[PDB]
Each structure stands twice: as C-alpha cells, then as structure tokens.
Amino acid sequence: ATFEIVNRCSYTVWAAASKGDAALDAGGRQLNSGESWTINVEPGTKGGKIWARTDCYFDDSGSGICKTGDCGGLLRCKRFGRPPTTLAEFSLNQYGKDYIDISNIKGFNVPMDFSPTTRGCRGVRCAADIVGQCPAKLKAPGGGCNDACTVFQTSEYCCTTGKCGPTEYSRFFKRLCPDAFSYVLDKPTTVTCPGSSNYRVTFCPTA
C-alpha cells in the first residue's frame, strides 16, 4: 500500500512511520513545508502509525532529538514516538478490509487529515487548533498538548483495567476533534476501507 505523506504546515516536520517493533519503509524523513514523501507499507500491516515530529536535530548518522514525537533519537523510526503525537493509525488487509483512524490518545502535536486516495470510503480529520486551546495542565512545555494519561498516570486516564469513562480532559480533545479517539474506550471513529486501499496523510490540511 502506498501512503503519500504531505506537509502543508508552514514549518518543517519529520514524518515517522512504524508498527511499534519495526520501521515502515524508511521509518522517517524530513519534510519541508510543502514537501511530499511516498512510502510503501507492506500489506497486512497491523497496528501501523504515522505521525509528525517537530523541532528535530539530527547528526550525519541520523541520531538526535525531537521536541515532539521523538522515537529513541532516530531519524529513521523503528519504534513509536514520545507523546504528544497526533496519530494516523491503520491496520491493513484484516480479513479483506483496511481500518483507519486518527487518535488523540497520545496527545496532539500537529493537525492532520488521513484519507484514502482510492475509492470506497471516507477520510478522517483532526485539524482544530488543539495546541492553542490546550488546557493549562496538559500543555507540553516541549510543545504540543499532552493526553491526561501521560500527564497524570492514573488507571482512569490510562484505562488500565479496561474500565474507564470519558473525563474532563478527554472531552476537550473530543470537542475540538469529534472524529478522533479521545480516550481508550471512546466510541470508535474507525473507518472501514476496501482491503489494499492507498492513502494520503496531510499535516496542517487547513493551513
């Protein structure tokens, strides 16, 4: 499957793509404002994620640091990134279908649209100014808006027992972005697409 990753932000981002225990394609790349990077993701990829990283520095070996979404200091991510990270999430070729969503469960750093480029389903978007409107207690000094689990580490926010409800914090993310997961047990906003669809992830789709 092809994913075209497009940076429409006015600032550089470092795109990342991983399934948690391995890179997808090269795993990461710099995208200047306006740049597009097309990656190939193996069919059957379960639990894949794409995200943006901001304010990164890498040396000639591709080691460094990002202020949001850092994946063990690598340019080419092999693991998931450090919150806050808006997440494009996907599982491909799962019994004949693809499943896509956007999640704020690990916080929000950059607005995103995640849409198919092929027929048969709709896209999802979280493009509101969540960082600007972020509650004081969730603001990440390094940049972005943390999820409550990251900040407070309670069973209720982290849904450790599989028994949790919405919270004042989850409701903030849900109010700004109804079409993204706001907590672990949120009413699913997952979209079912034909198996083997192709996609575009756009950072800053409205600006």
Alpha helices in the chain (DSSP H): 130-133, 148-152, 155-158, 168-176
What span, in angstroms and rounded, lies between the C-alpha atoms of 124 and 202?
Answer: 11
List phi, psi (to 5°) of 138. -100, -10
Single-letter residue type at 171 = R
CA-CA-CA-CA torsion sign (15, 42, 48, 204) = positive
DSSP 95: T
Residue pair 143/68 in contact by the 8 Å Cβ criterion: yes
Rounded to 5°, angle at Cα 114 from 2 and 130: 145
Pair type for strands 97-103 and 87-94: antiparallel
Q: Please choose, from the candidates 112, 21, 13, 126, the residue with its C-alpha nearest in 3D space to the C-alpha of residue 69.
A: 13
CATH of the domain at 62: 2.60.110.10
192: three-class secondary structure by DSSP: strand
Q: After which residues is the chain broken (C to N over 2.5 A)?
A: none
Domain of residue 54 covers 1-207
Q: Please choose, from the candidates 11, 100, 118, the residue with its C-alpha nearest in 3D space to the C-alpha of residue 49.
A: 100
Resolution in A: 1.5
Q: Please choose, from the candidates 19, 8, 75, the residue with its C-alpha nearest in 3D space to the C-alpha of residue 50.
A: 19
- For residue 156, give Cα distances in angstroms to 53, 165, 189: 28, 7, 21
What span, in angstroms and rounded, lies between the C-alpha atoms of 14 and 92?
Answer: 24
What span, in angstroms and rounded, lies between the C-alpha atoms of 98 and 104?
Answer: 20
What span, in angstroms and rounded, lies between the C-alpha atoms of 89 and 47?
Answer: 7
H/E segment holding residue 149: helix 148-152
What span, in angstroms and rounded, lies between the C-alpha atoms of 206 and 93?
Answer: 30
Count of the separate structural domains present in the chain = 1
